[PDB]
Design a protein around this ligand. Structure first.
Ligand SMILES: Cc1noc(C)c1-c1ccc2c3c(cccc13)C(=O)N2[C@H](C)c1ccccc1
Ligand SMILES: Cc1noc(C)c1-c1ccc2c3c(cccc13)C(=O)N2[C@H](C)c1ccccc1
Lengths: 129, 123
């Protein structure tokens, strides 16, 4: 039973002094890539930061030091928080590798992440040049 | 003309299914295949179409993910290491033939990073 306050603050989704832009690529990231992944049947555990209290995982944030989730990525894209598509792609990469680090190849959550990862790579193929 | 591609079947070769070989098809190859830079590596190097009269004068152990795919689907390998060697061959062939600045090399480097990330999790 994991106590209250065991979760770190979520990753920031706004920063007035960070330089940022809207680009054709970042707009495609929101309007095609994030949307396609969000609506997927396996998206839901990834739609918000991992809640180690609710999930009773006293080890999660002892192992994962660079948390990321699609809810954070969504808010970032909506807030035009990124300078370029690569910064956003790096957040997806973080989300996936975190899952693969914390969990075990047989786990349901891993099957879900592999599904979304393949979909992700497919949608990145048509990322505007 | 191009040489015949590498073999994907061989009745005399010792063969097994292992869980590691199944991981190589289901996770490693099937993730890599979807990557935006996978396409040049999905079939043998076509030296006629590419006008590379030196390619098969230099590369004598060609390999590609198309060959690897077929080999995994055909249960061609005895252990995961033979398949891993095929990937390593494909990558080093690219690095051998090309110059470090080349777009194909950056593509290769991206794919090899993903490949290593998946190999990291071999059971
Ligand atoms: C994603 C993710 N990355 O690391 C972990 C742990 C999760 C995770 C695993 C299992 C979860 C969740 C849930 C919400 C958010 C993150 C996670 C959640 O409800 N579960 C349950 C226990 C679950 C089990 C099996 C498949 C899907 C969800
Ligand atoms: C892979 C690979 N390994 O050695 C060579 C040469 C290649 C190769 C280089 C450039 C290619 C291809 C193509 C298909 C299959 C193999 C290769 C191909 O269409 N190109 C074009 C010319 C190309 C130029 C720059 C980046 C990617 C592809």
């Amino acid at each position: 039973l994991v106590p209250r306050g065991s979760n770190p603050p979520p990753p920031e989704t706004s920063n007035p002094n960070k330089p940022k832009r809207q680009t054709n690529q970042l707009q495609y990231l929101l309007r095609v890539v994030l949307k396609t992944l969000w609506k997927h049947q396996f998206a839901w555990p990834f739609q918000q930061p991992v809640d180690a209290v609710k999930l009773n995982l006293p080890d999660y944030y002892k192992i994962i030091k660079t948390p990321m989730d699609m809810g954070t990525i969504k808010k970032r894209l909506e807030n035009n928080y990124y300078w370029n598509a690569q910064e956003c792609i790096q957040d997806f990469n973080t989300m996936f590798t975190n899952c693969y680090i914390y969990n075990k190849p047989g786990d349901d959550i891993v099957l879900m992440a592999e599904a979304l990862e393949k979909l992700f790579l497919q949608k990145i193929n048509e990322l505007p040049t």
